[PDB]
Amino acid sequence: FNESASIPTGLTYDDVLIIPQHSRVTSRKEVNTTTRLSRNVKLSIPIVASNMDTVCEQRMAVAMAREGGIGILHRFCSIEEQCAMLREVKRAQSFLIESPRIILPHETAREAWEGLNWKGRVGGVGCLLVVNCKNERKLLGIITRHDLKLADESTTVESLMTPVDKMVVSTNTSISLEEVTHLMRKGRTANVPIVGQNGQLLYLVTLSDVVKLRKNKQASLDSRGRLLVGAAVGVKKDDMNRAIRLVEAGADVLVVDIAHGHSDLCINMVKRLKGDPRTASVDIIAGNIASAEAAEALIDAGADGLKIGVGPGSICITRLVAGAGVPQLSAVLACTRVARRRGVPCIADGGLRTSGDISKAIGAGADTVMLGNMLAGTDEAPCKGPVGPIVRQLVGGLRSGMSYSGAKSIEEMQRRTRFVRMTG
Amino acid sequence: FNESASIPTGLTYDDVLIIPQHSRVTSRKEVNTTTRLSRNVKLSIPIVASNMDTVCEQRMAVAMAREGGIGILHRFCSIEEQCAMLREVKRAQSFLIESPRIILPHETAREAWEGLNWKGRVGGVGCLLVVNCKNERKLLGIITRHDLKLADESTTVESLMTPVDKMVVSTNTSISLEEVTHLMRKGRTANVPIVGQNGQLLYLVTLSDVVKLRKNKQASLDSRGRLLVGAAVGVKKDDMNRAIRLVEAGADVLVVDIAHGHSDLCINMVKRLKGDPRTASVDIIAGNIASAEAAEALIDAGADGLKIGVGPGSICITRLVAGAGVPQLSAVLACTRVARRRGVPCIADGGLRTSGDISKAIGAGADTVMLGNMLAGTDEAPCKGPVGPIVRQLVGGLRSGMSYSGAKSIEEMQRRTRFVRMTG
Amino acid sequence: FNESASIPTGLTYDDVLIIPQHSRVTSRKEVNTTTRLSRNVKLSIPIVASNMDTVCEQRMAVAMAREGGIGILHRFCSIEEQCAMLREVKRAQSFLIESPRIILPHETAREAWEGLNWKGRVGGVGCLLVVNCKNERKLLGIITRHDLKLADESTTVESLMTPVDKMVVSTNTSISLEEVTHLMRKGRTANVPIVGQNGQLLYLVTLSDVVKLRKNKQASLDSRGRLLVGAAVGVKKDDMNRAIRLVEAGADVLVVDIAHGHSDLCINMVKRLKGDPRTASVDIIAGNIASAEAAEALIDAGADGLKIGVGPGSICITRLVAGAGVPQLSAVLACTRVARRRGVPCIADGGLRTSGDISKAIGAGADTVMLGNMLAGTDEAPCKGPVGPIVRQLVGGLRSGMSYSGAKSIEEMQRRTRFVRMTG
Amino acid sequence: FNESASIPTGLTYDDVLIIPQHSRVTSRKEVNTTTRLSRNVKLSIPIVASNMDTVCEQRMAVAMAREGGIGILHRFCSIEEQCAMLREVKRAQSFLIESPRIILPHETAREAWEGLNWKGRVGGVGCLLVVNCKNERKLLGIITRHDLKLADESTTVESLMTPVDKMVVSTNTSISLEEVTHLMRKGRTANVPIVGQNGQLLYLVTLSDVVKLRKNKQASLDSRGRLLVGAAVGVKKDDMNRAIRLVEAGADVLVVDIAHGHSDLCINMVKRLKGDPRTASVDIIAGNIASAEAAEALIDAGADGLKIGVGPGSICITRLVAGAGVPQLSAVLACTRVARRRGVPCIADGGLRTSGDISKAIGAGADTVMLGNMLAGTDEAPCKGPVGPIVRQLVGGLRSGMSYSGAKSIEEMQRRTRFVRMTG
């Protein structure tokens, strides 16, 4: 029986509890949860919506970013479809709206309503800019839902619009948030177009965006004020074309995601994505892995972040079909030991059932957790309600776990936490 | 065994089916469902929300009226509370808003937000009129949520408001719906105050109301454009004071509602309510009753409508505690026979589980049905969702039942329907 | 199929509802529920606890009487046992206590406690009278629990008792309730012994009894102030001896109770009980029966009350084993028609599941209902709680049913009620 | 309560049993079940598969016909789709195959396999005829699956086919079943093409069809040897175009099927279908109806068969939503009384749960039953197994019911059956 006695033992979240430490924390608000998703992407909260076709599409990715997390768009769809979700997420908010929706003065109120309910943004857009033609885009005026509420379906846009000479316009393509705020206050307006030397429409700044930029300072934003979003790719020859079109559609990170990340296909994919200027301009996250040697390999291939989890859940296809997997706490412990020394953030992916588990994942070295089941069947997933409050409570649980380790930040949580193992 | 053989048999909804008749109906939209609630109150759809503390308070009464039905506010609360719900329902929409919410120019943006979220209307109000003082109410300007979105909590209302000289005002206290519509179109504004000879604020007309008055032509409205609502009273000495305060708060009908309406207390209450000018200005509905002689008595007492149903449900307190009741179809058949001859509408109250039952209730002579259980636990009741779509489907079922009797109107449904009795 | 078509149909309680009548009742308290149990026994409420070994022994019989009803002691026990329960019920309260518990001055505090917890009364007795000897019973003093609370188990009763010269005594063997009340008020005492010309103890009047006689004016009392109780006998040769010992133990009525009362054994038993002076001094109730001819026979045999019900419940031994029975409403209708004309009260026995059923039983002509299941498993039955509140709610239901028939009394309920028959 | 007492009572199948009659039947096989579907369509067994999108498409319609019944193709699909199912059913078997599948000699074995698995027939076709070109169709040879079993995907059809000079051919376009049988026996062949004066392919006769025509003499066949099938239409303007395309695709009857057949829309549709030569060449069946007057109306409109059943099932949309319907036994009794006198067959549609119910339907006057639920979830419906054995047992039950009425035929079953009504 010696061969059996020498098999090591792996621990999942349910095997351990965080041991209560000395805590100097004197206020719940002193606990900071900002963290890294990959070498070059910070997040206010360490929550990632899983790239599952039951969890993360446009609406989920928008909500996560607004909470200060991020979502990874899944790849079980056509390249065109996956880029379309991406474009919509990027369209959700901005500072300078590139290519704002326009309409022509001799179109009807019916066509205006259709323009305002554009499918390029969930919920449509708040106004249409009336310009002379699609070629030149000389700004003549503006039309909102308010301008249509008493019109007959056939009335001209020109009859109804606010003319440009009664609008507040700017030619400052570098206008600051304080500047356009002042413009909106002085002019009592809610839309400021940016036009060029000859009155041609270049951008739109909306009061709706200015308000978001002043309030939810937690949102995950790219440099243009748009919501952060990531997207997954496979490793097949065609996934490279998918990656390129995703980066061009606006992806902020790429996630190489196959069930068995400690494979030559996965490493070579990482090398490929990093070695092409069309894709090396965003961080490359790779997985899934469960061992230190795997973590070594992917890091050495160039990965900017690792996704941890092979057969993490107690009943999952990987365990029942192939018989493979690693209990997730051991896997997070083994992988982050290697990755910490290399400065590579780790996503703990799978097997998390409660906010208490998130605290253990971080305590065991992860920088973010990825959530599938806990977020499926929320409103924004493709019954549980809206995902925002679930996420906020999860972060609340984590903060509470952090205080039990006496940690005021994610690094401290990783350095300070001590586990104790249960049985029955 | 002869004494048992001579007991008559009563039928409930589940004993019968509507027999399919010859139908000339060539379109679902040819079926008209307008009906009478009482001698002087018409309704577009024959649905009444029951005066139960689990069903009908402000939100339910508002929704029913908007669907074209009505709700009866229950009396299991203080007179002040019941009038407060009434006032709020009346505040939900109007044509001329009497006593519109005001604010003073040296108040703060924080006080403006509080004014805009007034508890006198569910959802607050859409604007505040800035006037010189509460005494004189000289109109200086207007302030909306839009005007506050970039203000600091301590900024003056005067700094933020649209001044009156930039507003559209009217002195026409008799302005028509077409008139103020034109004012709103020409001026691109969404609020038109009505002021007096010296600029004192008298009324407010809002674009929000004008739009409702043009669209949902089905709503149950009093002469001022407000939503129709009724309220219940008991028969005790104090219920007369309740009735008077309810009429003065705006009730459109009073419902005398006790479990045993064929009683001297109930008749005398009806005589009392009709014999006092403070209450005889609205229709008096009375119940509950289940026999022809009872219907006779209440009509003779002066009732403008009868509410039918004593022990209507298969398992209800009345049957289990007292052992009394009448199967509801027989009760509707007996009572409406008497009432039809007298021109007195009948509410079939209780025992309705499906839209099919509503069709039988009407088929058996009722002019309206009252719904408790089917409407409890909707959003607007104090999980099923919003009540609007449930009501719309119920009316859909009724229209379908009407077509099976080949009826294009409620009268025809009552005159044409024939029943067949089931068993096992 | 003609032979089947001619079988008559019988109705149980669940086939009918009381039809709501015109009610002049202007207050719940105007409804009087007093009724007759037998020709010579009135009751404040028409509730009888069934003579079942799971329902009615001493504690149940006491509670029913205190509520204003009565219990029938069951006969499934030895004559000695059944008389013992009877004696205890009679011992529960009185005006003049015959043979009050005594003790001798040289007995110990331990023996006093044992005397005070006499098993002849549930709860023991409130005091012991200290007399000179069992033969003469010359009153020397009184001892209560209060007098023992600081005594050692071996202290003499004489050391602890209140001596007679400090007591309030009376020689008035005909003392009235107002008289002894005055004695108790002037003397601040709670026990007044009645002694004879030579100081020999004859009776005891206790403040506890005086208080009951002033408060619960609803209790069912015999002429001596004791609780009313009845007892059941069979029809075998030995049941005559049981009847005689029961009457002598204090029974106020005898109930001849066999499953098939329309039998020669039952009639002859009634003739026997009525024809013997040892038993003809209390009313003779007989049953069980379900037909008019049976009611005729027993009345003609001399019965002072009939107990109605043969196979009354839907699942009972009589129906499943023998296949016999009558639906209980028909049985009550048939039997009381005969009995009303003869002035013989009827107990509706069995098949009652709710207070609504009690109202139907009375409505169908019964003068009392007998309850088994509804009272079993109450505290006073040999989990539901105490029987008092269950009984009070049952009477409440009946009063409510009475108001639906517009009846202010039991006779009116019987004369006025009208039924309607249900189906599905 | 008089108005309730006068409502008539309707019976469903579960209210009655067939009364056993004197039976002279001396063998199960003496019971003949042939019947009429409509004035001009006979069936060997009275079973019709309901025109429900869960029951009857191509496979169901084929199986029913082979059992000797018929299926009605449902209309919840596009005209093109409904005709496509029709064409396939007609393609299932034939005597002379019109337009048999061909192939050209220089096509490949791969293209032959694709031809043999044509989607125009469930299961494909048994051979391809090799002809010179699509224009002329000069027969050069024949190719079957057997001819391909050792070929490489690129081998020429010409290399593999049996050449025409080794085939058995006929020029007899009127060849009888005995004639072509003899040809197949003498020539040991399984396919006999019919060619014209110049060797052009006109028809194909297959051994597979000859065998079916000799064995299952019960099948429902049109004059060409194809399986009988019917199709449903609505009453909207476009259903006339659907009817015309269905007749042209080969429909043997049309079924006008709306929930409320006693309507002007339905009558006018019947008049329309009968008054157009494009549709008056097949029988017009109409429904659904439940009254004698309705039966009168449709017959008078010209209907060749009535479909009986409005709200036939205990829990169906019609009863729960509209509250309408007729217990199905009464409805069959009322309608067939009228229709018998006019020679118009009746389909009892709905509410049948067991083969015993089928016997009652026939006993009550129906000529056929329509089955939905009992046939859904069989293999041939779009788990219960194959529909053939279920149908055969149903017919077995009916034959047994027929023997209990002592009937040797459907007419006798209708004339002889007597019902008895149950209760609990």
Author numbering:
A (entry chain A), B (entry chain A), C (entry chain A), D (entry chain A): 3 to 384, 436 to 477
What does the publication say?
Here, we demonstrate the determination of the crystal structures of T. brucei GMPR; a protein that, unlike the GMPRs of host animals, possesses a CBS domain. We further show that TbGMPR activity is regulated by purine nucleotide binding to an allosteric regulatory site formed at the cleft between the catalytic and CBS domains of the enzyme. Our kinetic and structural analyses clearly demonstrate that the CBS domain has a pivotal role in the allosteric regulation of the activity and structure of TbGMPR, facilitating the transitions among three conformations: a tetramer, and octamers with relaxed and twisted conformations. A combination of X-ray crystallography and size-exclusion chromatography small-angle X-ray scattering (SEC-SAXS) analysis clearly revealed that TbGMPR can exist as a tetramer or an octamer depending on the nucleotide species that is bound to the CBS domain.
We further determined the structure of the wild-type TbGMPR complexed with GTP (TbGMPR/GTP) at 2.50-Å resolution. In this structure, single GTP molecules were found only at the allosteric regulatory site on each subunit of TbGMPR/GTP, indicating that GTP acts only as a ligand. The overall structure was almost identical to that of C318A/GMP (RMSD = 0.66 Å for Cα atoms). The hinge motion in each subunit and the twisted conformation of the octamer upon allosteric binding of the ligand were also observed in TbGMPR/GTP. The present crystallographic study of TbGMPR shows that both GMP and GTP share the canonical site 2 on the CBS domain, whereas nothing was observed on the canonical site 1. However, the affinity of GTP to the canonical site 2 was higher than that of GMP as observed in the fluorescence quenching assay. These findings indicate that, in the presence of sufficient concentration of GTP, GMP no longer activates TbGMPR since the canonical site 2 has been occupied by GTP. Consequently, the kinetics of TbGMPR in the presence of GTP shows a Michaelis–Menten-like profile with a decrease of the nHill value to ~1. In the presence of GTP, the initial velocity of TbGMPR was upregulated in a concentration-dependent manner, and the EC50 value was estimated to be 4.8 µM. The addition of GTP to the reaction mixture enhanced TbGMPR activity by decreasing the K0.5 accompanied with the increase of the kcat value in a concentration-dependent manner.
